[PDB]
Design an enzyme around this catalytic site. Structure first.
Site, mmCIF file in Angstrom:
data_model
loop_
_atom_site.group_PDB
_atom_site.id
_atom_site.type_symbol
_atom_site.label_atom_id
_atom_site.label_comp_id
_atom_site.label_asym_id
_atom_site.label_seq_id
_atom_site.Cartn_x
_atom_site.Cartn_y
_atom_site.Cartn_z
ATOM 1 N N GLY A 135 21.240 16.906 33.769
ATOM 2 C CA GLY A 135 21.493 17.188 35.172
ATOM 3 C C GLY A 135 22.452 18.349 35.352
ATOM 4 O O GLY A 135 22.176 19.290 36.099
ATOM 5 N N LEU A 243 23.580 44.100 25.106
ATOM 6 C CA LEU A 243 22.748 43.102 25.775
ATOM 7 C C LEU A 243 21.533 43.716 26.456
ATOM 8 O O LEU A 243 20.514 43.037 26.624
ATOM 9 C CB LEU A 243 23.577 42.326 26.801
ATOM 10 C CG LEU A 243 24.685 41.417 26.272
ATOM 11 C CD1 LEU A 243 25.264 40.564 27.391
ATOM 12 C CD2 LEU A 243 24.148 40.541 25.157
ATOM 13 N N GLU A 245 19.641 46.063 25.207
ATOM 14 C CA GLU A 245 18.620 46.297 24.192
ATOM 15 C C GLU A 245 17.741 45.071 23.967
ATOM 16 O O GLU A 245 16.577 45.210 23.573
ATOM 17 C CB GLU A 245 19.295 46.729 22.892
ATOM 18 C CG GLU A 245 18.447 47.612 22.000
ATOM 19 C CD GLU A 245 19.175 48.015 20.736
ATOM 20 O OE1 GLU A 245 20.417 48.142 20.781
ATOM 21 O OE2 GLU A 245 18.510 48.201 19.694
HETATM 22 N N1 LIG Z 1 20.042 20.365 20.312
HETATM 23 C C1 LIG Z 1 20.907 19.706 21.076
HETATM 24 N N2 LIG Z 1 20.458 19.055 22.205
HETATM 25 C C2 LIG Z 1 21.326 18.382 22.993
HETATM 26 C C3 LIG Z 1 22.677 18.336 22.686
HETATM 27 N N3 LIG Z 1 23.296 17.595 23.633
HETATM 28 C C4 LIG Z 1 22.366 17.184 24.528
HETATM 29 N N4 LIG Z 1 21.140 17.658 24.137
HETATM 30 C C5 LIG Z 1 19.853 17.464 24.824
HETATM 31 O O1 LIG Z 1 20.043 17.881 26.154
HETATM 32 C C6 LIG Z 1 19.288 17.086 27.036
HETATM 33 C C7 LIG Z 1 20.169 16.739 28.227
HETATM 34 O O2 LIG Z 1 21.403 16.178 27.829
HETATM 35 P P1 LIG Z 1 22.806 16.849 28.263
HETATM 36 O O3 LIG Z 1 22.800 18.335 28.006
HETATM 37 O O4 LIG Z 1 23.925 16.194 27.491
HETATM 38 O O5 LIG Z 1 22.985 16.567 29.841
HETATM 39 P P2 LIG Z 1 24.189 17.269 30.653
HETATM 40 O O6 LIG Z 1 24.021 18.770 30.590
HETATM 41 O O7 LIG Z 1 25.537 16.860 30.109
HETATM 42 O O8 LIG Z 1 23.993 16.796 32.181
HETATM 43 P P3 LIG Z 1 24.487 15.346 32.683
HETATM 44 O O9 LIG Z 1 24.954 14.513 31.512
HETATM 45 O O10 LIG Z 1 23.325 14.651 33.350
HETATM 46 O O11 LIG Z 1 25.620 15.509 33.669
HETATM 47 C C8 LIG Z 1 18.840 15.849 26.275
HETATM 48 O O12 LIG Z 1 17.432 15.833 26.221
HETATM 49 C C9 LIG Z 1 19.418 16.009 24.885
HETATM 50 O O13 LIG Z 1 18.413 15.746 23.936
HETATM 51 C C10 LIG Z 1 23.137 18.987 21.549
HETATM 52 O O14 LIG Z 1 24.332 18.948 21.261
HETATM 53 N N5 LIG Z 1 22.246 19.673 20.745
#
Ligand SMILES: Nc1nc2c(ncn2[C@@H]2O[C@H](COP(=O)(O)OP(=O)(O)OP(=O)(O)O)[C@@H](O)[C@H]2O)c(=O)[nH]1
Ligand SMILES: Nc1nc2c(ncn2[C@@H]2O[C@H](COP(=O)(O)OP(=O)(O)O)[C@@H](O)[C@H]2O)c(=O)[nH]1
Ligand SMILES: [Mg+2]
Ligand SMILES: [Mg+2]
Lengths: 423, 155, 424
Positions: A135, A243, A245
């Site tokens: 989110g 950036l 490029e």
């Molecule tokens: N590759 C990778 N994916 C991540 C990581 N953290 C979260 N995700 C992915 O990101 C997606 C969303 O999770 P988050 O980014 O933690 O959500 P947020 O941005 O914190 O937003 P909210 O928690 O809803 O407030 C999920 O599908 C996870 O699989 C990370 O550290 N590495």
């Protein structure tokens, strides 16, 4: 000369940690900020006391993740004013990230960015790290990108999106959030590197030999590939030195600005040739986004080698692939592969499951087969929006229902834009 | 956009910045708003080295603009004898007509570029070509009391 | 999104409520005096959620219940101010709990709710335990919910509502009370765990082979379910971490937020469990309708969303495999138009007395069976107009019953619509 990095949501923040961990090893910078040893000051600034501070902002609508930043190995590296946290998270809802919660903190965040931009003399633009399905990552980023296109409109902005994957997916509505941000962030992004968490999962299970990878596993692999793309900006190479490029070389259409990144080699910690690794750049198993470039046309293609590399080996491996494979290009493209080399070896983390390799390569290629990834999201989106499922959550947090359709049409139009180029 | 930088470069005459822009795959036959290729602009403002470079990298010597102006039209108008001869050598249309009915011989005669008139004539310029009002290059020399041009038109 | 305010209302409310506090106090390593005697950080990592001492408010018109709680095992720990109790009882009259006597007291309760919320870093939402066939737990609880809903509209409302069944009390006005209460919950709460006494008796009688189940026997199944569904909330974990995210990934349509909980393995009161289950065995207690806390057959409907919580040390690889298996080997039972609608999460700390366990929270359209039963009993009673003078005398209008009847039937129809829906 300077580039500012921004990290939004847990994804951005935790991948940020992995990248700045890896940047500081590549630049011999200490956890406390010191250095016993310019091109690298594109990313870092300097204190009067010989301390090297990142040009970075960390943003999350919730403490937990950024709290671990400022009580961890690299707590001293960042100024506390760079690490910004709210209290109520977006709860996997783009609406809350963009409209309801995001408006409460957007001004503080934009203000703290101005403090880093005021320290800079010839600011280039922004690197932005964020998830799709999150989110915060979806909603707040797309808002921040809108507002950066005003307050810094005449300069570049690059995305590092984390494409969602059911194997680590935390939410049902992640297709929604992906579509919604990609619609509103389309006009405000100059170039955007997608990272399919499924490919990173697949790679870590096969080549790193891990049964059930953790986020640390995925982030480390990701940070290695992000380092390969930003190496040109941090060591003053010949290719992709600033950036602009990135857009010049990889973006021959404002909308279609989504390169496929391919990285070899990924060697477990339990050497290859220049030719062997360059063949692996055209093997789908080592891509960051799961698609089949054989089903698509290349608009551009760059090779970023780093390490023990002989420029002639490269030209041999290129001619091998240009003759012994059929890499289809579009007719209105320079049919020549751009190259750059940086003789410093790929740094890994001490303890990492990834091994130190003698040489490595990261191929950035704007293939039309990446449309397959948009099709997978669009399809999942369509199933749920057909029943207006979960839509009340979004509409009840300041979002008009129409915005769903306007976004979907913009994704349908983008799928047509990929098709017409490749025919 | 690299096609817009090449248009600007060929005009302002930055020989090096043309070579650089072409090294990144810039469109040699890129048009501006009014259909002017870099060859148009280089041939208008007398940038001989840029003209020869564009021609050797596959520029349409006979490209017209929105008003039917070929590069040979503009070179003979402004009076760039060096470029006129280069264009003709790369197969330029000596008797191209533009939206106003003028040929390169009309424009070189009006502006008094007698040396270019002689070159165009020797490449088979049409002395009997007429413009919209119905006037040839020879009619222009008679109507404008220009006996030096009348003599070179009958040589 | 950190703290949760807990409320328990009515006899049942404070019974399964206290039982819940007994269970998770042990799990977090708190003694009845309110002191940590644990041995792990994974226990106090998110102790701030339910504790400060519990963040619990105790409510009943029946003053006797006060003592039944304090004279219980963990009765000493609850804050004395957070006890709010009336002089007389509601006597199975929903109107008395919602309009007359329960309404007189509800202000005093909101004063304490305010007090506990006031000193919260960042509130998540609320948590109410209550029975639906009663007068206090249903009538005053639903009135409390609405009163909080309007005073705290930026927060989640999460209820553990237990459904009446003739198998546990022969009072015939319960269909009235539960129907009126469901008419409230569908409009006033974000998520509601449907605890069915019909199913609790059928489990204690048929699966556990106890010829006469007591409340204590039924309450054991409940308290263990609650600790199971709140495992994500109480320990560190990526998935379904806070109340809002849970509801976001569980509730696709606002009115259809009635979860059918169920968990495994089913144990008796303090019996011995020598043989620990395997991962594929636990997984095969999902469709196993003899493990559902609501008396519904998942086979007779379709899952909109599912949350699985595996507790204990086990193979994350095998759990993923078994869950990915059981989904596609029964692909016709999970709705197609919600992709990746099943979500699984693991917690290494097992529940008390078990080496492994697994709780199965499901938004299944089969739940319409439960609302069918309540409505037919309601209508049978309402068509003969029995005992209406109780409710009408307390200020209620006969019309209200018709509206609640119709509104529950709309709720049943909605579930039937999405069951027969197609992706095509
Ligand atoms: N590759 C990778 N994916 C991540 C990581 N953290 C979260 N995700 C992915 O990101 C997606 C969303 O999770 P988050 O980014 O933690 O959500 P947020 O941005 O914190 O937003 P909210 O928690 O809803 O407030 C999920 O599908 C996870 O699989 C990370 O550290 N590495
Ligand atoms: N599972 C369970 N159900 C109960 C318990 N006590 C009462 N009930 C049920 O709740 C209903 C009676 O409501 P009750 O809570 O006693 O009335 P209240 O005090 O006015 O809220 C009936 O359906 C009972 O079967 C209990 O301890 N456990
Ligand atoms: Mg988050
Ligand atoms: Mg009572």
């Amino acid at each position: 000369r300077e580039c500012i990095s921004i990290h939004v949501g847990q994804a951005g923040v935790q991948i940020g940690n992995a990248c700045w961990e890896l940047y500081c090893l590549e630049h011999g910078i200490q956890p406390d900020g010191q250095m016993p040893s310019d091109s690298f000051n594109t990313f870092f600034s300097e204190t009067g006391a010989g301390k090297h501070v990142p040009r970075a902002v960390f943003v999350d609508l919730e403490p937990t993740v950024i709290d671990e930043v400022r009580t961890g190995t690299y707590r001293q590296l960042f100024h506390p004013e760079q690490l910004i946290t709210g209290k109520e998270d977006a709860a996997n809802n783009y609406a809350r990230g963009h409209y309801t919660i995001g408006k409460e903190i957007i001004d503080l965040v934009l203000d703290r960015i101005r403090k880093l931009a005021d320290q800079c003399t010839g600011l280039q633009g922004f690197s932005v790290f964020h998830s799709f399905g999150g989110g915060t990552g979806s909603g707040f980023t797309s808002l921040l990108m809108e507002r950066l296109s005003v307050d810094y409109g005449k300069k570049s902005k690059l995305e590092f999106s984390i494409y969602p994957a059911p194997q680590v997916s935390t939410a049902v509505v992640e297709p929604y959030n992906s579509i919604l941000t990609t619609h509103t962030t389309l006009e405000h992004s100059d170039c955007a590197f997608m990272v399919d968490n499924e490919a990173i999962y697949d790679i870590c299970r096969r080549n790193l030999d891990i049964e059930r990878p953790t986020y640390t596993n995925l982030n480390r692999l990701i940070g290695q590939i992000v380092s390969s793309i930003t190496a040109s900006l941090r060591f003053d190479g010949a290719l992709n030195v600033d950036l602009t490029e990135f857009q010049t070389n990889l973006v021959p259409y404002p909308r279609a600005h989504f390169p496929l990144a391919t990285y070899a080699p990924v060697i477990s910690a339990e050497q290859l040739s220049v030719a062997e690794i360059t063949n692996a750049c055209f093997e789908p198993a080592n891509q960051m986004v799961k698609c089949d470039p054989r089903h698509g046309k290349y608009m551009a293609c760059c090779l970023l080698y780093r390490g023990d590399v002989v420029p002639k080996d490269v030209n041999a491996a290129i001619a091998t692939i240009k003759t012994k494979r059929t890499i289809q290009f579009v007719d209105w493209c320079p049919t020549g592969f751009k190259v750059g080399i940086n003789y410093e070896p790929p740094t890994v983390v001490p303890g990492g499951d990834l091994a130190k390799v003698q040489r490595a390569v990261c191929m950035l290629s704007n293939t039309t087969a990446i449309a397959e990834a948009w099709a997978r999201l669009d399809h999942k989106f369509d199933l749920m929006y057909a029943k207006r499922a979960f839509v009340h959550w979004y509409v009840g947090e300041g979002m008009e229902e129409g915005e769903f359709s306007e976004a979907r049409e913009d994704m349908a139009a983008l799928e047509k834009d990929y098709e017409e180029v490749g025919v | 956009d690299l096609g817009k930088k090449l248009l600007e470069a060929a005009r302002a005459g930055q020989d090096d910045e043309v070579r650089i822009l072409m090294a990144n795959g810039a469109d040699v036959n890129a048009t501006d708003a009014s259909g002017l290729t870099p060859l148009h602009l280089a041939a208008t403002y007398g940038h001989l080295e840029i003209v020869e470079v564009l021609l050797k990298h596959g520029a349409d010597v006979n490209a017209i603009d929105i008003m039917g102006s070929t590069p040979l039209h503009l070179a003979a108008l402004i009076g760039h004898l060096e470029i006129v001869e280069v264009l003709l050598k790369h197969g330029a249309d000596v008797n191209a007509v533009d939206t106003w009915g003028d040929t390169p011989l009309h424009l070189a005669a009006i502006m008094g570029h007698l040396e270019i008139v002689e070159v165009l004539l020797k490449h088979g310029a049409d002395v009997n070509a007429q413009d919209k009002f119905g006037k040839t290059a020879f009619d222009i020399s008679i109507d404008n009391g220009n006996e030096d041009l009348a003599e070179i038109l009958q040589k | 999104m950190r703290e949760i305010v807990h409320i328990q209302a009515g006899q049942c409310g404070n019974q399964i409520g206290a039982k819940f506090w007994e269970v998770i106090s042990d799990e977090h390593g708190i003694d009845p005096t309110g002191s940590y005697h644990g041995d792990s950080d994974l226990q106090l990592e998110r102790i701030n959620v339910y504790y400060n001492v519990p963040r619990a408010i105790l409510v009943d018109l029946e003053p006797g219940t006060m003592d039944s709680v304090r004279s219980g095992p963990f009765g000493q720990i609850f804050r004395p101010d957070n006890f709010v109790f009336g002089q007389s009882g509601a006597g199975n009259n929903w109107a008395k709990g919602h309009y007359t006597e329960g309404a007189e007291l509800v202000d005093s309760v909101l004063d304490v709710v305010r007090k506990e919320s006031e000193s919260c870093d960042c509130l998540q939402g609320f948590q109410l335990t209550h029975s639906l066939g009663g007068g206090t737990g249903s009538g005053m609880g639903t009135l409390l919910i609405s009163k909080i809903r309007e005073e705290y509209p930026d927060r989640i409302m999460n209820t553990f509502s237990v459904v009446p069944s003739p198998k546990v009390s022969d009072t015939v006005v319960e269909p009235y009370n539960a129907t009126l209460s469901v008419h409230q919950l569908v409009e006033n709460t974000d998520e509601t765990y449907c605890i069915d006494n019909e199913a609790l008796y059928d489990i204690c009688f048929r699966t556990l082979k106890l010829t006469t189940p007591t409340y204590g026997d039924l309450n054991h199944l409940v308290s263990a379910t609650m600790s199971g569904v709140t495992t994500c909330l109480r320990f560190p974990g990526q998935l379904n971490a806070d109340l809002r995210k849970l509801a976001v990934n569980m509730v696709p349509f606002p009115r259809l937020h009635f979860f059918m909980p169920g968990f495994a393995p089913l144990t008796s009161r303090g019996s011995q469990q020598y043989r620990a289950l395997t991962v594929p065995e636990l997984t095969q207690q999902m469709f196993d309708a003899k493990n559902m806390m609501a008396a519904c057959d998942p086979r007779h409907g379709r899952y909109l969303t599912v949350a699985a919580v595996f507790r204990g040390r086990m193979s994350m690889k095998e759990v993923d495999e078994q869950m990915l298996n059981v989904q596609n080997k029964n692909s016709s039972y999970f709705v197609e138009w919600i992709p990746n609608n099943v979500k699984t999460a693991v917690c290494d700390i097992p529940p008390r007395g078990l080496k492994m366990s697994a709780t199965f929270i499901g938004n299944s359209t089969a739940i319409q069976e439960l609302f069918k039963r309540i409505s037919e009993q309601f209508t049978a009673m309402f068509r003969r107009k029995a005992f209406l003078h109780w409710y009408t005398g307390e200020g209620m209008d006969e019309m209200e019953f018709t509206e609640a009847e119709s509104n529950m039937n709309d709720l049943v129809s909605e579930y039937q619509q999405y069951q027969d829906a197609t992706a095509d």
